[PDB]
Point group: C2
Chain length 444, copies 2
């Protein structure tokens, strides 16, 4: 009973047992919940998911950038086993406990910037984003929030409002929280089709956004600008150099809280501890979740002390938040990243994947763009000889990969992005094999 | 190493070690997070919380109605230990797993009503409430939601909007989600000061609410009425007999989705599986969290199939939701309730507590009202010979109980309610002792 780090197809995909389990799902779970690949998981670790039929699939999704340090990481297993025996919940607002404080300290340490910082914990990315806005409004005593045109921030009313794409995230769920405005992001590949300078010069892309913010809202009415350092669900869009620094600067000059949403990019994923570290961005607040606790429901807001302390006592909280078992897992996750060279591992994975995809792109112009950092890499698929999105090809490729025992996700505003989010504990051999399969499907 | 089911004071409260840990909390955690009793927990089970100084305190809060079946319940410990080894997270929307489906099935079974039902899982009460609204709007294609004047529903933008009390829940955090309207609830004790018939006749209290809903909103503009079967944070307010049934009926006659928020009342807490069971209320949707998984972050929306299936595919979800470890805990929690007679235990606790508090009230008219069901009981404190709230006395009593090693919570719109939320696994002796201490503090 130890999990073999090799792909294995005993059945077609999905298999007979998964198909049986699926009858139960259809009869019990709301039809609002969509499933990408309906194989039922019995076990996972390293770079492998094992299903109910005995198949072993190559994980190139890590549950959407969550099991970065690998499913059921051994330090996490240990930390959880010990904590679950001591206590499962006290509610930190009732009687506190050291595990919550320890996590706050570690986030204060590892996040960008070097001043006084404070943290608060919740259970989901959407909750943390919600609280970053509460914090910013309490501090500034201003109303509006600016989000970007490829942004994804969550499924609650306000975070739906912050999100750009109507289907499936927003359609039919409003009316939405007021005072949300939308600005254009740095999207080099498609900016390039119109203005070559904007695509390469990030400061100029920031000016484009700032001119609109100033005209349509004004700093005097603005609490916060919120941005993903790399847009996730919107299509793994890495902004031009200079873009994030220029937003930061403008926010400082204008008493607007600058918020980095690092829910997807955070915790070693991009080849640094946080995506903001690549250009030395120091946001006023940074939002984290997903990879923070190796799959346990936990999220955080971390930021400048003066800002984070603005809400009255008892103004922030929630019953479950900073659950002590989830905290034990968070501590073991941070420990794992530092002691096992995960940031460097992310950088190895970049070199391996970029090298394959760039060689593929030279051979096949259906790859409009190859972009990303660390273990967060994507290709955008287009019709040969143009820049027109090819969603059809994107879906066919993913469906073929699934059928070949490869868990690969799509994303993108136009439905034409293949994304790669392997756990860092994937072997180079499994990672290459996953890439081989993608190349074979595209070749014929 | 087994936890002694007896109160013990080795130090004053809080003790020197807790006070040391508190310096760390103040330096790391946002000042927005308030703490009721700053003792740092190292262990808990049965009816006892053990702190960092070796003190053993009587738990009369269960983390705000969360550890109903006891901290670190043995079936939960077992279920969690096994699951954490298999996998920690796949994201149900990526690749599903049986644990999530199993939980959906169990909630479909144990919730009120007998038709076709479906469930969806999230991580917090606030998230589940948010999703009940999304579901209702998708189904009805109407905008407005009605909540009540003692309501508490969560700390996100929309759930803040649904919540009645500005301090500390809402102040400075808006603007809020639009189309939330407020109606008057059945509050027998204080309704009685004005109209004796309204306080006893629930159907008449429903008419009062329905007349306002009709005048200020209209059914043709209304997606949902949402209500707590017993108002929690608002002061443990049990409505008059007939109130909930009459709302249900009106909602059916008018194509408005009726939503029971059972986040606090759910899972054996009130001497039935759900608070709605006492009058046979069958809501269209019921929202659950808190006690569902013995402290693990998990929440649910369960309801009529046709309603729950209204959102398009991928319209509902979230990354962490229905975490497999939290699900293992939920299954063990339901198993624990049924196999160990917890519902009956809740009823024993009612008889014990009501008997003490009613005898206390006959002797001491500072107890304006004694109310509640099962292990959800409260007294409302007032100035002797009137019905004027006495918040001061309420705080003094709780502070004195804390100093005597009793974890007891306050609540209420007017800050004058002592509430009792012991874990069901408290012994009668510890429960009586907790009541003895309260009686002694009030006597002199
Ligand atoms: Cl094979
Ligand atoms: Cl370019
Ligand atoms: Cl609260
Ligand atoms: Cl490199
Ligand atoms: Cl003692
Ligand atoms: Cl009465
Ligand atoms: Cl999502
Ligand atoms: Cl009884
Ligand atoms: Na179905
Ligand atoms: Na402080």
């Amino acid at each position: 009973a130890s999990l073999d780090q090799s792909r294995l197809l005993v059945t077609e995909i999905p298999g007979p047992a998964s198909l049986e389990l699926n009858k139960r799902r259809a009869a019990a779970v709301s039809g609002g919940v969509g499933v990408t690949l309906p194989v039922f998981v019995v076990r996972a670790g390293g770079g492998i998911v094992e299903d109910a039929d005995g198949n072993r699939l190559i994980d190139l999704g890590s549950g959407i950038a969550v099991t970065t340090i690998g499913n059921s990481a051994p330090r996490v297993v240990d930390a959880v086993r010990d904590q679950v025996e001591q206590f499962t919940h006290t509610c930190f607002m009732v009687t506190p406990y050291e595990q919550y404080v320890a996590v706050a300290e570690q986030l204060n340490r590892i996040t960008p910037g070097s001043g006084e910082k404070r943290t608060v914990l919740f259970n989901s990315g959407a909750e943390a984003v919600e609280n970053s806005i509460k914090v910013a409004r309490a501090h500034t005593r201003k109303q509006a929030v600016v989000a970007f045109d490829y942004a994804y921030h969550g499924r609650t009313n306000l975070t739906m409002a912050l999100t750009a794409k109507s289907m499936p995230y927003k359609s039919g769920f409003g009316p939405f929280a007021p005072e949300i405005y939308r600005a254009p992001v740095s999207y080099p590949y498609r900016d390039n089709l119109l203005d070559k300078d904007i695509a390469t010069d990030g400061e100029l892309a920031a000016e484009r956004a700032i001119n609109l913010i100033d005209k349509q809202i004004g700093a005097a009415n603005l609490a916060a600008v919120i941005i993903e350092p790399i847009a996730g669900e919107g299509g793994f869009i890495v902004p031009a150099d200079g873009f994030l620094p220029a937003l930061q600067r403008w926010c400082r000059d204008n008493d607007v809280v600058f918020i980095a949403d690092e829910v997807q990019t955070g915790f070693a994923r991009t080849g640094a501890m946080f995506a903001c570290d690549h250009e030395n961005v120091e946001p006023d607040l940074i939002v984290t979740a997903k990879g923070i606790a190796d799959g346990f429901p936990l999220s955080a807001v971390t930021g400048r002390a003066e800002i984070m302390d603005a809400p009255h006592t008892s103004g922030l909280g929630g019953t479950f938040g900073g659950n002590p078992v989830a905290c034990a897992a968070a501590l073991a996750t941070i420990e794992t990243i530092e002691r096992d060279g995960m940031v460097e591992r992310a950088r190895q994975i970049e070199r391996l994947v970029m090298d394959r995809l760039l060689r593929l792109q030279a051979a096949d112009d259906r790859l409009g763009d190859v972009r990303g950092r660390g273990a967060m890499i994507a290709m955008e698929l287009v019709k040969s000889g143009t820049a027109e999105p090819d969603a059809a090809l994107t879906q066919k490729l993913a469906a073929a990969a699934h059928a070949a025992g490869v868990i690969v996700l799509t994303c993108g505003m136009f439905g034409n992005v293949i994304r790669l989010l392997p756990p860092l504990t994937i072997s180079d051999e499994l990672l290459s094999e996953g890439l081989d399969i993608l190349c074979q499907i595209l070749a014929d």
